[PDB]
Chains A and B, each alone.
Chain A
Amino acid sequence: TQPKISLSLHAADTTIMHRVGMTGLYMTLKRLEKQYPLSRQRGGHISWFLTADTIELFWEGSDFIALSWLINESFQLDDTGLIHLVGLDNDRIDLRQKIHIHEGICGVFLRLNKFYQAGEIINTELRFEEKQVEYQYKSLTWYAHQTFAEKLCEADTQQLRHDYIQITSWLYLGGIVRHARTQNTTKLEEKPEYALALLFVPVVCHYCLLHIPSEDLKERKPHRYLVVIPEIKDFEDASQRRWRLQQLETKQFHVSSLGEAGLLYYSLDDIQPEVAYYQACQVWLYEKTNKASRQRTLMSIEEIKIDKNILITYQQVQKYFKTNYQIIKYKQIFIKVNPIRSLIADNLVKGIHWWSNFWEKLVIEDSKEYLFNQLFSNREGFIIMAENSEEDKQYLIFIKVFQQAMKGNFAKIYAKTEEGKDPPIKKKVERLRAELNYCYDELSFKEYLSDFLVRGGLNKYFNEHQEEIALLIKKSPWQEIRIWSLLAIASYKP
C-alpha cells in the first residue's frame, strides 16, 4: 500500500545521525520480525518492507496505536532495571555488558531527569576469579523514549503530525537550546520520520569509557563516556558490524584515546583484499565539566577514517603489544591500558609515522615505566615497526655496530675473567647504562661512545657502512644517539 512513513538513505536532507537512526530502525524491525514473524502479532498490523538502504512502513487503522506498540516493544526495561533494546541481541549479551550499555545511555542520552524516572540502586556481586565485585548501578523505571509517541502523533486525531516537531538534546545529541529565554522559538525542528530515527539512534552507537593516562586509575574511576557513531553505507553491513562488535569484552571497551575506541569499533570488521575497505565513524566525548557537574557535556567530536593499511597495522599492534591488565580489587575492576598502543593508533590516524616519539613516552615521560614495562613486554613489536621504518635503517645499522662493540667488550671481560670466578656481565651492563646516562653534553657523550667503539675491536658493520655511520654520529644530536645506544644495550641478545 501507500507509505505513510517513507525513509531512504539517499535523501539529501538527512545527516549522519539520521542515517544511524535509520540503521537502528532497520535492526529493531529485523529483531521484531524475528520475534513476531506473523502480521497479526504485530500491533496495529504494522508491515515493514526492508531493503539494503530503504525502510518502508505500512499499518492499519489509526497511527497512534501502531507507533505506541512499536515504541513500547522497541524500548523496554528488565527486572534488574537495565536498558532493554530489542535491536541488540540481549540473550547472548552478558549482564556486565548490559550494565555498560545502560550506564552509557543514561549518561549520554538520558542525561536529564526531566526525561526519565529512576528506580532503586541495585547492587550485584558478580564473580570473577573467586572475587565477587559488587556492581552498583541505578535502576530505571520510565523514560521519554517509551512515551515519545504522544509527541509524535497529533493529540486530537491520533495521527502523525503534518508539520515540523520541536526536538531536544536527548533525541539529537548536541541539540541544546543555546538561549533558554527563547526556548519556545529557537528549538530544533524535524519531520516525524526523522524524529523516529532520532528516537532509534541509541541502539546503533556503542559506548566506551575513557581513562586519563595522567590520572591514576586507582585514584580516579573512569567517568568520561565516548560515543562511537558510525557512518552508514548499508543497513545490513551496519547490522552485521554491530552484532559482531557485541562479542567483545567490556575490558576492551575501556580505552585511553578516542581513536582507540574508534578503531575498536572497526576491529572486528572482516578484511577483504579484493574489496577496497574504507569505513568512517564519529567519536563523541561526554565529560563532566567540573567535579560537581550534574550532567555530562559534549567536550570533543572527532572523525576517524580507517582504510585497509591503518586497520591491518592496528591489528598488528594489538597482536604484538600486550592487552589491558584487568586489575581487580575490592569491587574495583581496574583496567590497565597500554599507552603505546594508543600512541601508535593516534599516529596512524594522523597518518604520521607511528614512531613519532615512543621513547619519549616510554622513558622520558614514563619514568614510572608504566608503558616502559609495556616496552619491555613489546620491545620486539617496537623494533618490528621500526624495521618497517626505512629511515630507521641507519639507526638499525648503528644498533648492530654498538652491539658488535659491546660483544667485543664482553669478550675482553671474559678473557680477563679468572677461572672459577663468575664474570660480572650484568654489573658491566648496569655500568654501561649508568655511564651513558651520566653523559651530560655532546662532547662527553661522543668521547665515551668513540672510546667504547674503539675498545670493542674490529667491527664488521662499522667497516661496511663507514661513511654512513660516521655521518650519523657527526650529525645526529647526542641525546638521540644516547637513546639509540640505550636501546641497543636493551636489545642485546647473543
Chain B
Amino acid sequence: MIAPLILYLDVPFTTFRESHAREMGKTYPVPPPATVYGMLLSLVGETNVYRHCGVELAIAMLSSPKKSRILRQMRRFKNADFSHPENVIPCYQEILSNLKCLIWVRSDEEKIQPSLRERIQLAFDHPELVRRFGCLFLGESDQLIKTIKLAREDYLEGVRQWAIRDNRGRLTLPYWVDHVGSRNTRFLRYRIEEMDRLSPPDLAWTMVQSPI
C-alpha cells in the first residue's frame, strides 16, 4: 500500500483560535484537521472544498510551542457606517510560536482522481507546473509558513508528540469547519500522547468528511 506522503511543517507564528472562542482569540494547542486540510487545498490550488473529502490526515508535533497573547484592534461588522468607531474593538488573540510538526497524508479513501496525495507530490516535484494564487499560510492569512518540504519519518530522528483520537481527551479539534455559524462544524476529541514512533498510530488518521 503506497507509503503515505509526509510533509515537514515549520511556522514561526500561528493561531488556530477555537470556534466557540469568539470573544477571545484563544487557540488550540495543535493545528486542527480542518485548517491543515484547507492549507493543503491552498497548496494544491484547490478552491472547491468538496473536491478532496475522505483524505486522512495525521499530525506529529515535533516540539510543544509556547502560548502568547497579543492585542489587536480587530474590525467587526457592527454598524453600517465603516468609519463608525463601533467597528473597531480591542481584544486579545493567542498565538503559537515556533511550531514544528510533521503531517501524514493518506488519500486512499478519496473517490475522485487524482487524489490529494498525488496532487501534493506532483506539486513538489514540479513547482512551476502548479497554478494557484495567494501566499501559503497556516491559520491567519498573515501567518506565513517558514518551511514546508517533502520529508521522511527520520527528518528529526527524535521523539514525537502525536495527536490521538481519544473519547476522554482534552482537545476538541474540528475536522470540518462551518464558517458562517456552527451548524455544520464537526468536532473530534483528541489528546497529546508522547510516543517514540516514526509512523502514526491508527487513530491519528483523522479522516475528513462532509458534515452530512
Direct A–B touching, Cβ under 8 Å: yes
Chain A contacts to B: CB under 8 angstroms? 9-17, 164, 166, 169, 172-182, 185-190, 231, 280, 289, 297-301
Contact yes or no, A301 B182, CB < 8 A:
no
The answer to whether A180 touches B182, judged by C-beta atoms less than 8 angstroms apart, is no
Chain A CB within 8 A of B24 CB: yes
- B144 lies within 8 A of chain A by Cβ: no
List the B side residues contacting A169 at CB < 8 Å: 23
CA distance A187 to B182 in the complex (A): 7
A-chain residues with CB within 8 Å of residue B22 when the two chains form the complex? 174-178, 188
Task: From B79, B181, B186, give the contact of A185 (CB < 8 A).
Answer: B181
Among A17, A174, A190, A289, contact of B23 (Cβ-Cβ < 8 Å): A174
B170-A188 in contact (CB<8A): no
B182 near A189: Cβ-Cβ < 8 Å: yes
Contact A9 B168, beta carbon cutoff 8 Å: yes
Q: Separation in Å of the B4 CB from the closest CB of chain A?
A: 24
State whether B186 touches A13 (Cβ < 8 A): yes
Tell which of B69, B170, B187 touches A12, judged by Cβ atoms closer than 8 Å. Answer: B187
> CB of B172 within 8 A of chain A?
yes
Known: A12-B187, A182-B77. A17 touches B92 (CB 8 A): no
Tell me the complex Cα distance, A189–B186, Å: 12
| 19 A–B contacts, CB within 8 A, in A order | A10-B167, A11-B167, A12-B167, A13-B172, A14-B172, A17-B20, A164-B183, A174-B22, A174-B23, A177-B22, A178-B22, A181-B78, A181-B80, A185-B181, A187-B181, A188-B20, A189-B182, A190-B182, A297-B91
Enumerate chain B residues within 8 angstroms of A179, measured Cβ to Cβ: 76-78
Q: Contact between B23 and A298 (Cβ–Cβ < 8 Å)?
A: yes
Residues of chain A lying within 8 A (CB to CB) of residue B180: 185-186
Given A231-B170, A297-B23, 7 other A-B residues pairs in contact with their CB atoms under 8 A: A11-B167, A15-B172, A174-B20, A179-B76, A180-B78, A189-B182, A298-B24
Complex contacts, B100 vs chain A, CB 8 Å? none
Cα distance, A190 to B170, chains bound together (Å): 19
Q: Which residue of A lies closest to B26 (CB)?
A: A301
With a cutoff of 8 Å between Cβ atoms, the chain B residues found around residue A189 in the complex are: 181-183
A289 to B182, CA, bound (A): 28
Residues of chain A contacted by B24 (CB below 8 angstroms)? 174, 298, 301
Number of A-B contacts (CB under 8 A): 81
B90 contacts A by Cβ under 8 Å: yes
* Minimum C-beta distance from B111 to chain A (A): 24
- Chain B residue numbers with a CB within 8 Å of A166 are 181
Closest to A169 in B: B23
Residues of B within 8 A of A13 (CB): 172, 186-187, 189
Who on chain A is nearest to B80 by CB?
A181
Question: Nearest Cβ in chain B — how far from A346, in angstroms?
Answer: 15
Question: Is there contact, CB below 8 Å, between A300 and B77?
Answer: no
Q: Smallest distance from the beta carbon of A475 to chain B beta carbons, Å?
A: 30
- In the bound assembly, the distance between CA atoms of A12 and B78 in angstroms comes to 34
Tell me, rounded to whole Å, the shortest Cβ–Cβ distance linking B185 to chain A.
Answer: 9
* Interface members, chain B 165-201 (any A CB < 8 Å): 165, 167-168, 170, 172, 180-183, 186-189
A350 to chain B, nearest CB (A): 11
Contacting residues, chain A, for B21 (C-beta < 8 A): 174, 301
- Bound-state CA distance A164–B186 (Å) is 13
For A188, the chain B residues whose CB sits under 8 A away are 20, 22, 181-182
